[PDB]
Amino acid sequence: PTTIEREFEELDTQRRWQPLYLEIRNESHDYPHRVAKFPENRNRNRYRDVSPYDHSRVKLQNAENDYINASLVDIEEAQRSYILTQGPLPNTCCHFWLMVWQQKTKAVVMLNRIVEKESVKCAQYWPTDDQEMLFKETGFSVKLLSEDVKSYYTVHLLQLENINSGETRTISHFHYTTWPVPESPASFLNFLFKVRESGSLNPDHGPAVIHCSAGIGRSGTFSLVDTCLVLMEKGDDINIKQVLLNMRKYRMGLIQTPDQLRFSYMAIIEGAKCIK
Numbered sequence: 690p691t692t693i694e695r696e697f698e699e700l701d702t703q704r705r706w707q708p709l710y711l712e713i714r715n716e717s718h719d720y721p722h723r724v725a726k727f728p729e730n731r732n733r734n735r736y737r738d739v740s741p742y743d744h745s746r747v748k749l750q751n752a753e754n755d756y757i758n759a760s761l762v763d764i765e766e767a768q769r770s771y772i773l774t775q776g777p778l779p780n781t782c783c784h785f786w787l788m789v790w791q792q793k794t795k796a797v798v799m800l801n802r803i804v805e806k807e808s809v810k811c812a813q814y815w816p817t818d819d820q821e822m823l824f825k826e827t828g829f830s831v832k833l834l835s836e837d838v839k840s841y842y843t844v845h846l847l848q849l850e851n852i853n854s855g856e857t858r859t860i861s862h863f864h865y866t867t868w869p870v871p872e873s874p875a876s877f878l879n880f881l882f883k884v885r886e887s888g889s890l891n892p893d894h895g896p897a898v899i900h901c902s903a904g905i906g907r908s909g910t911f912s913l914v915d916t917c918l919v920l921m922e923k924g925d926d927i928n929i930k931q932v933l934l935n936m937r938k939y940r941m942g943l944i945q946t947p948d949q950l951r952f953s954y955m956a957i958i959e960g961a962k963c964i965k
């Protein structure tokens with residue numbers, strides 16, 4: 690039994706998952722997010738209570754308004770860096786692809802459906818058929834090259850084209866389509882390591898773009914499990930609470946429910962076991 694397994698059982702029998710999440714909420718530092726609250730940036734935010742910090746937000750270079758609801762989450766100890774962003778709005782899809790191009794991003798990880806519970810959680814920012822999707826505001830076009838439909842997720846091969854220079858880039862779109870938290874981390878871990886197998890999270894590429902609806906809940910679960918697993922391969926005894934609080938310095942409110950926190954503990958334990 691490892692230290693993480695000992696702690697996981699202690700929280701389970703003592704039923705201390707909600708006070709632990711309350712501790713993480715109370716110890717979370719607040720950072721200024723002034724740019725997100727500008728009146729001109731109101732239509733660029735999906736939710737009023739979700740904003741990127743000024744010190745870690747991703748800037749759209751050489752644009753009139755450089756703002757996008759996206760945060761660069763850097764973890765130097767794990768040599769990992771993700772871009773956690775919101776589900777693009779119909780008017781911010783052009784900015785979403787401008788960010789992907791400027792940051793040299795290789796893959797996009799989508800952990801939500803287009804509609805969920807009678808509500809649209811994300812705009813259709815990529816084409817579903819052979820028709821080209823134009824984004825004249827930033828000068829980009831997206832074409833669907835291939836699609837691999839699996840049981841719980843779908844992988845779309847996309848072509849991001851700079852319509853002004855003709856340069857094209859292949860983007861791997863990993864779309865997890867069956868997020869309820871899941872009762873078992875087997876499906877989530879196999880989806881995460883399929884993203885790992887593509888080499889998209891490797892340092893020779895730009896930061897991968899992780900996003901759900903708000904980009905803090907399910908995206909925080911994906912980033913926390915992946916980062917903690919990398920830190921375990923380095924032989925380091927990790928403090929999952931401290932790792933999560935450190936990532937919360939780059940984007941507010943990572944992990945939204947105690948169940949998401951408990952699922953992150955399960956995915957880290959089962960993920961490290963599958964390597965053994």
Ligand SMILES: CCc1oc2cc(S(=O)(=O)Nc3ccc(S(=O)(=O)Nc4nccs4)cc3)ccc2c1C(=O)c1cc(Br)c(O)c(Br)c1
Binds near residue numbers: 876
């Ligand atoms: C670490 C990623 C990962 O973690 C998982 C966890 C489960 S689980 O929740 O059922 N838990 C589990 C399942 C099996 C074991 S086990 O260690 O007893 N068996 C095996 N380990 C490696 C190959 S067979 C230990 C824990 C299932 C599947 C996976 C899984 C994968 O699907 C997976 C594993 C590898 Br290695 C890989 O290269 C890729 Br791609 C995906």
